[model samples]
Target: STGSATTTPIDSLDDAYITPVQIGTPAQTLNLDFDTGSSDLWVFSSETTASEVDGQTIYTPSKSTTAKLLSGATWSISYGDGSSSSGDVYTDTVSVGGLTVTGQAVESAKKVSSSFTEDSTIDGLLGLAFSTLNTVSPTQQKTFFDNAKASLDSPVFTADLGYHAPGTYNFGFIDTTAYTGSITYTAVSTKQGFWEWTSTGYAVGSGTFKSTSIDGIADTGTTLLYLPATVVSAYWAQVSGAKSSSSVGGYVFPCSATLPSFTFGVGSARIVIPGDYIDFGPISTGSSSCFGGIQSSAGIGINIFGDVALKAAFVVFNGATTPTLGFASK
Candidate 1:
């Protein structure tokens, strides 16, 4: 069996990607972020505090005849950005695209941070990373992909994030027509419950490639690309009027500055991110200074290849016995 879903950017900056999901027997549909950086399927629901609810579509477990409380089960998760959510658990029928999984653990949000309440674009998050990272206590829950993998035609999923356009997420099979060029495969380290891998090297614009091993994780939940200070400095140095600002946070440059493309090596293959994509809008409403899509991951501990890099190519999260990641140009 297989499933396919369309993911659309929430804002002009492509802040996050959202896909519709059906939950409960009556099928209440909600827009959820398919996050590959975490491992918990949680949603805004009737259990959430009334004051915290915004314009999001909330899941009502009571409306589903198949819903059942997962007694004594609870969950809590915190993101790198400091946002968090926590709640009790329920097992219900959940569906993504045409794929259905019965008795799926659905964490109903009882409390949510202000950041989540203010964001009306997303109703919840559907984590695609390994189940080892699930935050459910007492009894860990498997992710939707993990629960559905055995029944699928193949144990794999693919992500195709777009700049200002809609992209797709496919489960069980890879769409050959979705990408161009031959895919370059690399080993994935699931020790930290992420799609972590090492890049062979990188190049700025048309410059020569530097041979260095850069370790990072493919995170769909994060908004920007974060690399080592040296790599980030090299790229920003090529852009005139670019500076690492204290007030605005991270790197910012003149809005009119010419930006250069960034290229990263995936085995023998190279994925190039266009310059236009790197000019990540302005720092403020009408500010002349724009923030960079790529920055230093110094404080982040590990480098992150977020939407800024994922949008540049088609990514495959292969879940075979020996997990691997595949990158291909599109």
Candidate 2:
């Protein structure tokens, strides 16, 4: 019952993080992004058209002795960025680190959008969200974590995401040695298929922290942080050359401008995000302008505390009785 997995940053892109996961009998190893935002464990596989499969490594069910098709079952998923992948379903042995789960549902991709096909490094996605969000047809499937939770020492997993550094996702047991301070716990509402939580207030720069409440979901897959449009605008007001441009998309500011720190209040805890992290690389390749990692969630209806914000802290996904998110400063 005690299990752990080490996750590392994705090369230099730093766009998405990945961890090693093994699927099928004899274990065909693949690098997977542990995404809490979505609930499907899909991989580029033999079912995919050869032309659609770029340089990514594929998981072939034919090679696995224990692989079984779910007959008429199917699964399809779309991301916020319009990237999508759809395919049939297979049940097989899935392992993460030293932990193994037999008869775990594995989605084998037959069709993938350009967004997924272009990124050849990501072999698949390991969903850590609630099992209710699973996409298998006829009947919803359970995630690798869900299947293995019963045997875990504790039904909780911790995400220790770092800034440009290797992170770890520990399952079953929480290694207290990873962080210094006490974890601040918050209740989560998973009705929307997300780890939704509320923030009492927020602040930009050295200014006073506002009392405006913020509702958000903590997503490991999403790269940027998103807030309400009004909150996004207030933060931009502090930057001299920052503007919301439809052409640039989201809020963009001059590269030279020094951005301010963003802070959010969670009960008595105030999490502060550095300005440099908020800069979020550049608008495009080799450009002097940059896009703010904090953007408007106007159309989406809920703010997203994506990797940009999560990387600033250590998080715990408590799945015991009541689902909760625990945060601690690194």
Candidate 3:
């Protein structure tokens, strides 16, 4: 068919990685990033040269003669941060955490940019968040959630992100055994791939982003709270005699610092960003300094949710039926 592939949600056998097997069989080893920032399934291809393939995972179609590649249609797209790459498309018998999705539409990068190359620890990324910010067309859709949404035991979908260690996430059943009461989801207004907001002003370390601070955009694509530098500095100061310099691009206070936990006041709803995230140090110069996560990028434009925060609660994307973002605890 020339139309876009069907996007649905499937049941995750055990939520091993919060990944699920959809329409394909597990012939080839395909993993997902379980990201909430965007909705697109990307993987490395066999055609990608090893030299250009440093930190990325390569999808081997040789395992499945059924794998079909759309040769000669190499494509390139960039992100808000200005990173980009290109690769051919392929259909293969693939597997997620447990679901076996056949004839899955996938992208293989032939020429990848530095942003993707630098973080080459994993093979590829599964943008599980939402598709509001994506630059691709339906002809390129390969999202597990979009494909398996129907096979789910429930109408709702939740993702429990395991930070750092296992770096795993789960899909399917809303384990009623995990959290009490009903699953709560905040309605979202789509503006780009990010779910954005405007605020009456929020206080961090005793200061407010504004007499009317812009409601920070909530994103699950990243792994830390990337706020503005000045706001981050002001926050760091609250963490005792916290001081920063070029040495560490991001802000992080002494571990022993008495920085009380700060809350992101979303109306009556408030979420706490663990103190350790503030204690984050510079990893690299991907952005301005590193600060592990909480660096200079707050209160100005967007608010990104990393493992530190994402792990605190469950996130759901009901885009299978409509473009909706929902959250529930597991």
Candidate 4:
């Protein structure tokens, strides 16, 4: 069996990608952020406090005969950005695109952070990371991918994140027409419950490729690309008016500055991120300074190849026993 779904950027900055998900018996459709960094399929629901609910849609389990309470089970999760949510658990029929998973664990949010309440674009998050990372107490729950892997034609899912346009997520099989050139495969470490890998190196603009080994996670949940401070500094130094501003909390440059392209190596293959993509929009509305999409990962503890980097190519999350990651130009 196979499934495919279209995901679109929530805003002009491409901060996050959201896809429609069908939940419960009658299939209550809600747009959810398909996050690859976490493992918990949570949603805003009828159980959530009305004050906590903004303009987002809510899932009412009582309306579905298929909804079953996972008694004594509870879940709570906090994100890197400091936003968080906690709720009870329910098992129900959930579908994404044409793929359906019966008795899928669907977390019903009872408490949510103010950040989540303010963000009306996404109703909740669907985690794609390993089930081991699930925050459910007493008993952990499998992700949608993990639950459907056995029945899928192949144990793999692909992400084609777009800059401003809609992209696709394919399950069970790879689409030959989705990418160009041959795919470059690399070993993946699920030690931290992330699609983590090591990059051969990187280069600034048209410069020579560096042969250093940099380890990082390919996180679709994050918005920016974070690398070593040295790498980030080197790239920013090439820009005329770029500087690390404590006020803005990151490297910012004049909106008119001509940014340079960034290239990273995946084995023998090199993926180049266009300069325009690095110039993240202005710091404030009508501001002349623009924040950079690539930032130093020193404070982050680990490097993250987020949406900024993923949008440059096609990424495959292969779910083999010894998992592997595949990258291809698109």
Q: Give the Cα lDDT of each candidate.
A: 0.95, 0.88, 0.51, 0.94
| Cα lDDT of model 2 by residue, 71-114, tens digit | 99999888888889899999999888788899999999999998
Over the stretch 1-330, how does candidate 3's per-residue lDDT look in tens digits? 011111221112111132332322335544444556666567766777677777544677665567777554444566546766666677665555554456656667677777666654445666665444433443555455556656655444555554332333345555455454455455455656555543333456545434445445545555566655655665666655456655654454444455544444443444555554344443443443333345556323565545555555555544534445444433
User: In model 1, where do residues sit more than 4 Å from their true spots?
Assistant: none
lDDT per residue as tens, model 4, 9-52? 99888988999999987889999999999999999999999999
Worst 10 residues of 2 by lDDT: 5-14
Instruction: List where candidate 3 sits over 4 angstroms from the true fold.
Output: 1-26, 55-57, 80-82, 131-142, 163-168, 180-182, 195-217, 228-234, 243-247, 252-258, 281-292, 298-300, 320-330
Q: For residue 12, what is the lDDT in candidate 2?
A: 55
Best of the two (2, 3) by TM-score: 2
Q: How close is candidate 4 to the true structure, as a TM-score?
A: 0.99
Q: lDDT, candidate 2, residue 66?
A: 98
TM-score of each: 0.99, 0.97, 0.73, 0.99
